[PDB]
Structures are given as structure tokens and as C-alpha cells.
Amino acid sequence: SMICYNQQSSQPPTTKTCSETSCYKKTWRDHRGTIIERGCGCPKVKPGIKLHCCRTDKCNN
Amino acid sequence: GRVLDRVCFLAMLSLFVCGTAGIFLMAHYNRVPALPFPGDPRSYLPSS
Amino acid sequence: LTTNVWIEQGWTDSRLQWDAEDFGNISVLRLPADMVWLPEIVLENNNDGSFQISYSCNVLIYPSGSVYWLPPAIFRSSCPISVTYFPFDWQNCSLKFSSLKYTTKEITLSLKQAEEDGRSYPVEWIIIDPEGFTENGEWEIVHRPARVNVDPSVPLDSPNRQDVTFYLIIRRKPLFYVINILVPCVLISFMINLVFYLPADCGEKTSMAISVLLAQSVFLLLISKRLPATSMAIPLIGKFLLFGMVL
Amino acid sequence: DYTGHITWTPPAIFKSYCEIIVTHFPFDEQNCSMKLGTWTYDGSVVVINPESDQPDLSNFMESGEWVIKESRGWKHWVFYACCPSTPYLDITYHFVMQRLPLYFIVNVIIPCLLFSFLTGLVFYLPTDSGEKMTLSISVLLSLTVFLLVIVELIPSTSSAVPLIGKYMLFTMVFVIASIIITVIVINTHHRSPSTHVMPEWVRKVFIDTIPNIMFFST
Amino acid sequence: RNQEERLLGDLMQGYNPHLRPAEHDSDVVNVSLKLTLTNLISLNEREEALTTNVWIEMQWCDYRLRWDPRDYGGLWVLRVPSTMVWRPDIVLENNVDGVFEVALYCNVLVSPDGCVYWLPPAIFRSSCPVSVTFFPFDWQNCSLIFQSQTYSTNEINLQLSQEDGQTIEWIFIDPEAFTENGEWAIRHRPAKMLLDEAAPAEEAGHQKVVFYLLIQRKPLFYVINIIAPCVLISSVAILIYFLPAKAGGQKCTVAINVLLAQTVFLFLVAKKVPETSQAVPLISKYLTFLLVVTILIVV
Amino acid sequence: GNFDVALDINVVVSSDGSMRWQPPGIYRSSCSIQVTYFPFDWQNCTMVFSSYSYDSSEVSLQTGLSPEGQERQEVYIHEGTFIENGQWEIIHKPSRLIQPSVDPRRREEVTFYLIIRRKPLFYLVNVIAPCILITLLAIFVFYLPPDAGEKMGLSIFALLTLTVFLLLLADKVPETSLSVPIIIKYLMFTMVLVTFSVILSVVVLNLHHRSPHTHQMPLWVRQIFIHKLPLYLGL
Ligand SMILES: *[C@@H]1O[C@H](CO)[C@@H](O[C@@H]2O[C@H](CO)[C@@H](O)[C@H](O)[C@H]2NC(C)=O)[C@H](O)[C@H]1NC(C)=O
Numbered sequence A: 001s002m003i004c005y006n007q008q009s010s011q012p013p014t015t016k017t018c019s020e021t022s023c024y025k026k027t028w029r030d031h032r033g034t035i036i037e038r039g040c041g042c043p044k045v046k047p048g049i050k051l052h053c054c055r056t057d058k059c060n061n
Numbered sequence B: 001g002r003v004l005d006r007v008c009f010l011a012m013l014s015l016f017v018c019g020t021a022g023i024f025l026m027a028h029y030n031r032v033p034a035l036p037f038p039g040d041p042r043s044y045l046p047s048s
Numbered sequence C: 001l002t003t004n005v006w007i008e009q010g011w012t013d014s015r016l017q018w019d020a021e022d023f024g025n026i027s028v029l030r031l032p033a034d035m036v037w038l039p040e041i042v043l044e045n046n047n048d049g050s051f052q053i054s055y056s057c058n059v060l061i062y063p064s065g066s067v068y069w070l071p072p073a074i075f076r077s078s079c080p081i082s083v084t085y086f087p088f089d090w091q092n093c094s095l096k097f098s099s100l101k102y103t104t105k106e107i108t109l110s111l112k113q114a115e116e117d118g119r120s121y122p123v124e125w126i127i128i129d130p131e132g133f134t135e136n137g138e139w140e141i142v143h144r145p146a147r148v149n150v151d152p153s154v155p156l157d158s159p160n161r162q163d164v165t166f167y168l169i170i171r172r173k174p175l176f177y178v179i180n181i182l183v184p185c186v187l188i189s190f191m192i193n194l195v196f197y198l199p200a201d202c203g204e205k206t207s208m209a210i211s212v213l214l215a216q217s218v219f220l221l222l223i224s225k226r227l228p229a230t231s232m233a234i235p236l237i238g239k240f241l242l243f244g245m246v247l
Numbered sequence D: 001d002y003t004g005h006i007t008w009t010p011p012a013i014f015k016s017y018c019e020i021i022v023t024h025f026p027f028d029e030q031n032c033s034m035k036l037g038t039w040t041y042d043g044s045v046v047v048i049n050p051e052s053d054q055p056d057l058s059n060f061m062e063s064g065e066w067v068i069k070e071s072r073g074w075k076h077w078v079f080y081a082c083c084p085s086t087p088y089l090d091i092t093y094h095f096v097m098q099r100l101p102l103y104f105i106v107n108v109i110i111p112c113l114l115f116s117f118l119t120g121l122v123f124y125l126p127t128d129s130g131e132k133m134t135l136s137i138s139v140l141l142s143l144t145v146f147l148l149v150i151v152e153l154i155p156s157t158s159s160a161v162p163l164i165g166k167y168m169l170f171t172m173v174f175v176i177a178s179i180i181i182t183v184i185v186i187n188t189h190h191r192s193p194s195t196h197v198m199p200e201w202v203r204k205v206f207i208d209t210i211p212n213i214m215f216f217s218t
Numbered sequence E: 001r002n003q004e005e006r007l008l009g010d011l012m013q014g015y016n017p018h019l020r021p022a023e024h025d026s027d028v029v030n031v032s033l034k035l036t037l038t039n040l041i042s043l044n045e046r047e048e049a050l051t052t053n054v055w056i057e058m059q060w061c062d063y064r065l066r067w068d069p070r071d072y073g074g075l076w077v078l079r080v081p082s083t084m085v086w087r088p089d090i091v092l093e094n095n096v097d098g099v100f101e102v103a104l105y106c107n108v109l110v111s112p113d114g115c116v117y118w119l120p121p122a123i124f125r126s127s128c129p130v131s132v133t134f135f136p137f138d139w140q141n142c143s144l145i146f147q148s149q150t151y152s153t154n155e156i157n158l159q160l161s162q163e164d165g166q167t168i169e170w171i172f173i174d175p176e177a178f179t180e181n182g183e184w185a186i187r188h189r190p191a192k193m194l195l196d197e198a199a200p201a202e203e204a205g206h207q208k209v210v211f212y213l214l215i216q217r218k219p220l221f222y223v224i225n226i227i228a229p230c231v232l233i234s235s236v237a238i239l240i241y242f243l244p245a246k247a248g249g250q251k252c253t254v255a256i257n258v259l260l261a262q263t264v265f266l267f268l269v270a271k272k273v274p275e276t277s278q279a280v281p282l283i284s285k286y287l288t289f290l291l292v293v294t295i296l297i298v299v
Numbered sequence F: 001g002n003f004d005v006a007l008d009i010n011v012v013v014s015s016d017g018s019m020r021w022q023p024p025g026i027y028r029s030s031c032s033i034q035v036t037y038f039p040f041d042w043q044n045c046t047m048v049f050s051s052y053s054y055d056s057s058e059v060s061l062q063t064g065l066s067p068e069g070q071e072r073q074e075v076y077i078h079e080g081t082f083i084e085n086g087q088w089e090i091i092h093k094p095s096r097l098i099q100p101s102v103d104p105r106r107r108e109e110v111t112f113y114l115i116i117r118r119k120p121l122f123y124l125v126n127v128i129a130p131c132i133l134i135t136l137l138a139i140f141v142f143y144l145p146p147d148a149g150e151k152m153g154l155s156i157f158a159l160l161t162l163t164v165f166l167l168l169l170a171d172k173v174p175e176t177s178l179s180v181p182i183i184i185k186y187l188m189f190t191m192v193l194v195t196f197s198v199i200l201s202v203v204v205l206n207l208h209h210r211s212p213h214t215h216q217m218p219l220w221v222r223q224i225f226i227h228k229l230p231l232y233l234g235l
């Protein structure tokens, strides 16, 4: 198991549990502002997107 | 006629290959410039 | 049929009259068309839904109460095509003008009355300025009549009872089709007689004949895109191509 | 309604951008979406809710080219780093469509199959007939003229090579290989006895090690 | 809504939307401009028209729309129809179809400091002169020129938008939401603000904001469907040198039928090449070369 | 997407309150095409008119009575000024009042139907007759001697002409996939016929040019094709 953060942007922190060995933080800017997506796994990000994949509990934030 | 054919085969094959290679390499080397504006060193992308 | 036509409408409005001596001898006034009553003449013959004139210009009013209005318009109307003698065909198109807002009881349509040497005559034709007119690239104009038609079949309270129709009888100039399609087609088709002179040992007869057939098929491919697929008649070039392919 | 309830059901023609995958065309499957949201209102002043999880398909006219396998509508909340209190809402309705391939099967694949079958038949034509390359080059001509039909019929996209494009290129390469090998066969057939001496390896391979049907006379 | 309606009524008292906001004389209304491209719809080469879907972000400030939130129950934002406020009449100057203006006139967002935010979407068909020399392996430099239709540089100062400390000198593209065009890839996307120093200051359209799109064509369709089949069919003609030079060898049949196939290919490409005349396209040059080679083979 | 009438005109209002409005309209309406028998097909096209907003409890629809009256159920066509479409003949033109199903807890409409038959002369001249001629030529390749050396040319150029006619037809046929038009079935049948003519011509040319010193005769071939079958085939 692995305990990973999953909240959006600067929301109150919330947490989930999954089976993958890595948590991911995904940052990208849209026309309104900056979006941060947190979860588990290491997704294949399209270019122009910052990705932080880390392999320790509660490492997204 | 046979020896004339053998000479002109090589001649025409050389012509065909040379023209094909010239056209294809002019296609291959037509790339977008590395910078949007010539003479300007900036790249005009959002820094990260 | 697509036309650029300036429609001239004249009518007396007894409310829009004045004596020129009480207004500084003013003898003409230009007003927006949205300020006055209009008969609302439209092209009933349109096939694209554009009933109305294009540019709603000013009306000219005069002390007598007469109202003159010359709106220009671009009109797309339905002209049925007779393909029987193509490309040596002539077509009969019409522009049918009437009011869908008013009936024969409300307005009465008539042709313009012009004057020569103090004698009046109805203008029974489409006006074309001879100096400024540029002929169409493929269509020559042969007749330009104009009529007022009142049919008794429809009821009297129908706005379609009265109309003014301007007709264009136009002949195609066949030069493009003669040069580019017809002459090559005929000359290739008449080469089918040459296989009778070809010997049977060195002259490949069937290859030549089937190649003439192939060229005829290519000419059918060319023709098929340029005419409607109607069933009133077979085109004349189509008749020749079918005859040549059978031969 | 007298309670202030408003129902408003306007129509629209929606022209929506959708990523089209042409890889498996004409057996391709598309997933195309419609993202709808309040343009100038965020989620704190206007809340949009889906009426149901599914788009309403009760009045859907059946299509002659596409079958909708599944459809759904998802509401999305978007929060930004600068403003942690104001959400931005949208509802995305998506439809998964499958192309009906009969038109392209009949009008493209079948003539390509017919031209492909006639490609190898030049190898049953004897060389003494003098009609081998007539057959081969004229099949090539038929393929080249049918290229016009295919280009007129298929969409012209450069995102990926479709299956029809791959089959067309395979058929063309098949014909060209048949032409090359037929030229080799015709050259072998017309080899003069005097100018071209027979190699021993050729005689060994093609005349001596021939355990194939003996209907032939070595 | 009572506070919102109160604020709107107090704000719209004596407000003329057709008069430029200036509190003192010789004031220049600063207008910041940003362009987001959501999808490159197409580039029609025969009309030389780039069709694009854009969202234009315009920010200016109007002293007449100022208010204090504490006087209106803490109201900190107001959505107003864009027709009721004064607008900088920003238009795409280089349009090819006659559409100068935005597609939808949405609401503006007025803030208590009087600063107005407007994000209208637009469909734009802009003029792109196509350089045809290397077609279909070409790249194009399309332009989107935005300027005020009516106001001059002494009236509005049209500049590029500033985010936190950095000027946005590029077309903005959403990394997540962008679907790439099926025939064009965007390599560079800069933005510039041009003001000719010797231009008349009283004339309207001299300060321009120009967004450039340098786009490379993906030539895979032409490679698959035109170029490679033509290369193969032309290379068939080289094989006639191995056929015998007698009756039944069929040299002339093969060569001339290859030429017939090349003429069919001329018809195929005739419906796809641009019709300008500064340069001969690369594909046209190659097809002419292949034709001439087949002619020489027949000779 | 166009719902409205073409032109804004007057409404005739009688003193008793009767309201007569006869607007013009140009309407592009959805017609699901049955492609199976194209271009010898007939189509059942439909025009559904209804109140967009008001329901049956507010606006009740009925079929428009003509000047004939007598509870008409027909589209009216004035026979003098109506020029028939050159491609289509109107067989039936009825009108009906469709009522919706009963709600346990669609709106009422007036529907005008046009059953129209295509007039196929163009396709008979341009597609069918050349196909018949090409098939007739494909028959006669078997009467060509093998020694003339012109079988492959004739057969494949017939196939090439068929491909040209496929190019001709590609611009005209419907693009749906619920069925195959009968004209496309005929075209593919003719293409398969010409392909089989090519195949059998290749077999005949193979038999004619079999090397005598290499290929020996199976005795069953000699029994059938030299002794038995010739007196059945009149050779
Ligand atoms: C309007 O825009 C101009 C720039 O185009 C601003 O000018 C500069 O602003 C910086 C930062 O405030 C100052 O340090 C410079 O001194 C300014 N230069 C000039 C030309 O004065 C200007 O401040 C903007 N005006 C408003 C009201 O925001």
C-alpha cells in the first residue's frame, strides 16, 4: 500500500491510499491560472507540464 | 543494341537517383529556424 | 440564375406632398425607406429564400406626392434547364415580382410608363444600359420582354394573383465546349474507322478500339459533372457519346 | 411557473473539436466530447448541475454512418492555486461512436482485392505469349486510376496512416514487386545461348534439384 | 441581487459607453492584451487563410466604474454585459473574410477598483501568405495583427499582458487541453508590440500587437498517397533496359504506360497544389522531373 | 438548424377574430435515404411542423383545409405554376396529424409526407449502358484467337474503363453504410466478371503456349477435351 495526497491546487489537504509505489504531483498553467493535480502512479505527462514523481508516503506536498 | 542499352541504363539510373536525392534532401533540410526572429537571441517561451 | 438587378418602383403617396413655395422652393426630398409606406415588392421566383432587395436605399419624394425608389438587388432564382441541345442550347429564365403583403385589392402592379416626344409608352422590356453593360462570359441575351400577368385560377384574395415578370431568353456561347470537349471527342471517335486499315499481324486493332472506348469514357467523366441529372431529355453531346460508344 | 421556475430548451448546431484517430479507419472508434460551462460566472455565483448521468437520446435520429455505443456526462470542479475558495464548474458530455464500414468495404477494399488477385496471375502467363507486361502494367494503370477514387472517398489526414492507406500501399508494392520479378523472368527466358553461358549453379538449382511435380520433362 | 442591482444602478447613472474613460486630460487608457489559442482549425492554402479559435483577454481600467465594497454589502465583483461598458475597439486587422470582431460578446467582470476584465471568444480567418517553394515539406509564418479601429496612441496604450513579474510575449496554449491540428505543428508562438516611431500619433491604427504562428506541415499524407507511389511507378520505367529489344519485349508499352500513370498523378496533385506564382512547388518540380525522365526513357 | 419562415409578411385579421397567416418558407428537412435501389429508388421524405413551446393543453393542431375543404389530408400543389423537379416525381403527398403518446405522469405535430420517385434516365445513359457494352466486350475476348496476342489488352482495358466509370459514380452515390446501392452491386458484379474473363483468358493462353517437349498430356485431358467435349461444343 501507499498513502498519497490527492487534493487539487491549494485546497485543504486530503489523502488517499493506493497500490502503486509512487505518488505524483502534476502542475500546469491554463488560461485562468495554475492547476496542481495530486495522485498516485506516475502518469505520462504531455509536454509543457511539470511532474514530480516521488516514492515516499505523503510526498506530493 | 544490347551494349547501347547497358550503357544508357547506368546513365538513366544515375540521373534518376541524383534528381531524387536532390529533391529529397532539399525537402529534408527545410526545417523551421531554431529561433522565431532572425538576429534576435530570445526564444519567447514561458520560463519555468 | 444569379442576377444583379435595380428595380424601379413608383407610386403616389398623397400624404407626402407639399407646395414648394412654403418651403423655399424645395422640389425634391430624400428620405430613408424605413420612414415611408412601401408596397414591399419581392422576387417570388427566388430559390434561396432571399425574397427581398439587397440595399434599402433612400426614397425620393416630390411636391406632387410621387415616390420614386430604386433599390438594387442580387437575386438567385430558379431557372429550369433544358439540356436537349447542349452545348448549343438556349434557356428561358424569369424574374417574377409581386407583393406577398398586399393583394390586388390593396395594390395594382403595372409597368413603368416612359415618354418620347410627349407621347407615353409602357416600358415592356428589361432596361440595359448599352454603354456600361458587360456581356456574360458564356450567355448572350436574345430577348428581354416584360409582362403584367393576372391569372384567374387563384382566388382574388391571394397575393399571387398579380405579378410582373421580366424574362431573359439567353443563348449559350458554345466556344469553350466546342474547343475543349466536342472537337477532341469527335476526332477521337472518328479514329475508330482506322482499325479497318490496320493489318492483322502488325496492327493491334482491338487495343486501338478499346482505347478509343476508354477515351470516350473519360469524356463521359468530364461531361457528367457539368449538367444536372434530369430526365426531360438526353444531352446532344450525351447522345453523340452514347452513339459513338455503341459504334 | 408561478414559483419562479424557468425551463428553457433552445436548439443548437454544435461544431465541437474532437481528436480523431484514423489508425483503424474504416473500423475506427471515436470518443468525442462537448464541454459546457458558464463563461463569465464561476461556481460560487452560478452552480450548474447535470440533469442526468446520460445525454438524452430518446429523440435521436439514427445515423447511417455511426453507432453510438456509450454516452455519459461528467461534472468537473476545477480549483486554482491563487483562489482556493472559488471553483470553476463544467459539464462534459461524451459519446463513443463506431463507424459503420460497409461503404468503404464495398467501394475501396473489394476493387483493391480484385487488383491484388490479378497481380500474381502474370506468373501463370507464359513468356512466349508476349502479353506478360501488358497484363502487369495495365493492372498498375487500373490501380493508378483507382487511386483517384480512393483519394476522392477517404478523408485526407496526416495524423496517422489509416488501415486503408496501408492496404493501398501494400497492393501497390505488391504490383511493383510483381513487375520487377516478371522483368527478371522475361530476361531469364530470352537469354541467348551464345552470349550468356549457363552457370552450373543455375542448372543445379533449377534443373537438377527439382523434385516438384514431374509433369515436366527435365 | 439587491446589492448587485444597487451597484449596477449606481454605476450606470450618467455612464456613456461610447466615451473613452479619462479623468484628466491627456490621459491614455492602458489596455493589456493576451491571446489564447484553443485549436488551429485549418490553413487553406488556395485562399491563403488561417482559421483559428482564440480567446482574447483584454484588461483595462475605467475610473467611472469604481466603487467601495463596504457600501454594497462586501460585493467584490460584478458581471456586466459588454455592450453597456466602454470597450477598446480591438480588431484583427489582417482578416481575409471581413470579420473584424469577436464571435461572442460575453460579460465583462468589473472590480471595485474599476478595472475591467473581458474574455470574449473569437473565430478568426486571417491572411497568411503561403510560401510554396518546399510544399508539401513547407513551414509557414502566419500573423494575427490586433489594433484599435478608432482610437490612436494618444488615447489608448495597447500593450502585452503582464502576469506575476513577467510579460506574456507569446500565444498562450493550454498544455492539458490543446488538441494538435492534424496537419500543422506549432513550433514557435511569439508575440510583439510594434509602434513605428515616425508614425502620426493622432492616427488610429499604428500601435499593433502582433501574434506570430510558425507552423510546420506534417507531410505524411502526401508521402503515403502521392510521393511514394509516384516514385515507385516512375522507377518501373527503369526496368525496360532489361527487356529484350524485339517483338514481345514490350519496352515502349511499359514506358508509355508509366507515362500515362504519371499523367493520372498529375491530375491527382492538380487538385491539391496552391495556385500562386512566385515559386514552383517542390512536388511540381519533382513531378515535372519524373515526366521528363520517362520521356527520355521512351526516347 | 433553421426553424423559422423565410419572410415576415402580413396576417389577415377578420372582424370576428379569424387569423390567417400564409408566410413563405425555404426548408432543408432531414430525409433518411434508403440507398438499396438507388438510382431506381423512391424516398419517403417528411416535414414535421409543430409549436416549439406551447403544449397540447395550450395549442391544439389540426390539418389545414384547402379551398376544396372537405377535411383535406394533402399538400396542395397548384398545377399551373408548379414546374416538376427534373429528377423527382411526386407520387403521394399526404398530410396527417400525429398525436403524442399518453404521459404516465414528444408534442402534437402536423406532418407532411412526400413520397417521391427518382427518374433514372441520366444513370441509364451514363452508367448502365456503357457497363452493358463493356460486359459484351468482355464476352468476346474468348472468341479472340490466342495467336493474335490481344486478349490481356482487351480484358484489362475493359477493367480500366470500368474503373473510370467507378470514378464517375464516386461523386453521385450516397455515402451511408446501412445498405449497398443496386447500381454499385451491378458495378462490382461487372468488375468481377471482367476479372474472371482475365483469369480464364490467362488459363487459355497458358494451355495454348504449353511447351510440347516439356509438358506431356494427361490422358484424361486427351479423353475429355479432344474426344468428348468437342462434339458437345460443336467443334
Ligand atoms: C501604463 O503602461 C505603461 C507602460 O506601457 C506604464 O509605464 C511604466 O510603468 C512602470 C511600472 O509602474 C514605471 O516604473 C515606469 O516609469 C512607467 N513608464 C512610463 C512611460 O511612465 C504606466 O505606468 C501604465 N499606467 C498605469 C496607470 O498603470
Ligand SMILES: *[C@@H]1O[C@H](CO)[C@@H](O)[C@H](O)[C@H]1NC(C)=O
Binding pocket: C020, C021, C022, C023, C024, C025
Ligand atoms: C420661388 O420662386 C418663385 C418664382 O416665381 C418666387 O416667386 C418665390 O419668391 C421663390 N421663393 C419661395 C420661397 O417661394
